[PDB]
C-alpha cells in the first residue's frame, strides 16, 4: 500500500454497497486445466478454495466514478506523473506523436506521451462520450488509491474468480462453456485477425460501457473481456500450487512479488493469440504500469 495524500469521506454501509453484490461465504473450484494453457501463467492446479463472504462491484469502475474521486482528492495518476501510457497502435490519431521505443514482444502497444485516463488515446482525445466506460490508464497504485478513498479495496484473485464464475463449477466462461451461445456475443474481445484487423462483430473495437452484455449468474458484468482488472495479489505462477490453509482459505497470494495479478481479459484478447478471456485465465502487470485496456473493480468486506 503506497502513501495517500487524501482523506476518506464518511459513508454509510448502504452507500458503499450500492452497485455491489453480496457473494456468500463458501467453497468453489479455482484455477483451470486447459491443456493449451501457457505453463508460465500458472492457471493450475484446480483446487477447492474457501472464501469468507464479501461484496464485489457489479461493474468495473467507470470514468464518471474515477472523475468523482479525482475531483474530491486531486489525485494524480501514475500515467500523469510518468508522462505517458500504453495505447493500442490503431487507436492513436496520426498527428499524435508517440515515443519511438517498442515493446519488443508486443509492438502493437505504443507509449504515448500525454495518454492518461481522461485522454485515453493521447492529447486531443477525451472521455466525454465514454462516461460509463471503464476507466483505463489506471495503474495498480491508482486502483488501490481509488478503492481506499471509496471505502473499499481490490478483490483478491480468488474473490475475483469466484464472483466471475457466477456460481458455475469449472465452466470455461462466466456464463458457461460456449463463447457465443446461440451465436450471441457475451463479451467484448477481439474478432478477426489479431493485431491486424478487429472486425468489431461484438459491437466494439475499444472499450464498451461497463453494463454491456448480460450479467453472469451473480450479477457481474464484463468480467470476461472489455478491460483487464487489477487484483490485490502479487503475481506468482506457483505459490498457489502449494496445498495449505494459506493457499486454500481466503488466499491472499504470495507475500512478495514484482507484478500484480490482472484478470478477465480485454477487448484485445483473441483465441489465436492469448486466449486469456477464460475465467481461469490470469496474467500480471507491474504496479506502476498503465494501459488503455486495463481497469479494475472493487470489493469490500461486509
Amino acid at each position: 500500500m503506497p502513501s495517500f495524500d487524501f482523506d476518506i469521506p464518511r459513508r454509510s454501509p448502504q452507500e458503499i454497497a450500492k452497485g455491489m453484490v453480496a457473494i456468500p461465504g463458501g467453497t468453489f473450484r479455482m484455477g483451470g486445466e486447459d491443456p493449451d494453457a501457457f505453463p508460465e501463467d500458472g492457471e493450475g492446479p484446480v483446487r477447492t478454495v474457501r472464501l469468507s463472504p464479501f461484496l464485489i462491484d457489479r461493474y468495473a469502475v467507470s470514468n464518471r466514478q474515477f472523475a468523482a474521486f479525482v475531483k474530491a482528492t486531486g489525485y494524480v495518476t501514475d500515467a500523469e506523473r510518468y508522462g505517458w501510457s500504453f495505447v493500442f497502435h490503431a487507436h492513436v490519431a496520426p498527428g499524435t506523436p508517440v515515443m519511438d521505443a517498442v515493446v519488443p514482444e508486443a509492438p502493437w502497444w505504443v507509449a504515448v506521451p500525454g495518454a492518461y485516463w481522461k485522454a485515453p488515446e493521447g492529447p486531443g482525445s477525451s472521455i466525454t462520450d465514454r462516461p460509463n466506460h471503464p476507466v483505463v490508464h489506471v495503474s495498480w497504485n491508482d486502483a488501490v488509491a481509488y478503492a481506499t478513498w471509496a471505502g473499499k479495496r481490490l478483490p483478491t484473485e480468488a474473490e475475483w474468480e469466484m464472483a466471475a464464475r457466477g456460481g458455475l463449477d469449472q465452466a470455461r466462461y462466466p456464463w458457461g462453456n460456449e463463447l457465443t451461445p446461440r451465436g450471441r456475443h457475451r463479451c467484448n474481445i477481439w474478432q478477426g485477425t489479431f493485431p491486424v484487423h478487429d472486425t468489431g462483430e461484438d459491437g466494439y473495437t475499444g472499450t464498451a460501457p461497463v453494463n454491456a452484455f448480460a450479467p453472469n449468474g451473480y450479477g457481474l458484468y464484463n468480467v470476461a473481456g472489455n478491460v483487464w482488472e487489477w487484483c490485490a495479489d502479487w503475481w506468482s505462477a506457483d505459490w498457489h500450487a502449494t496445498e495449505s490453509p494459506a493457499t486454500r482459505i481466503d488466499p491472499r497470494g504470495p507475500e512478495t512479488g514484482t507484478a500484480r495479478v490482472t484478470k478477465g481479459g480485454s477487448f484485445l484478447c483473441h483465441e489465436s493469440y492469448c486466449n486469456r478471456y477464460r475465467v481461469a485465465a490470469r496474467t500480471c502487470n507491474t504496479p506502476d504500469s498503465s494501459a488503455a485496456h486495463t481497469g479494475f473493480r472493487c470489493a469490500a468486506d461486509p
Binding site: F38, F86, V103, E105, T262, C284, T286, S289, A291
Partner: peptide, 14 residues
C-alpha cells in the same frame, strides 16, 4: 514463440 503478452509494462520499454 514465447508466452503471449497482454499486459504491457513500463519495464518492457525501459
Amino acid at each position: 514463440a514465447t508466452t503471449p503478452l497482454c499486459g504491457p509494462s513500463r519495464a518492457s520499454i525501459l
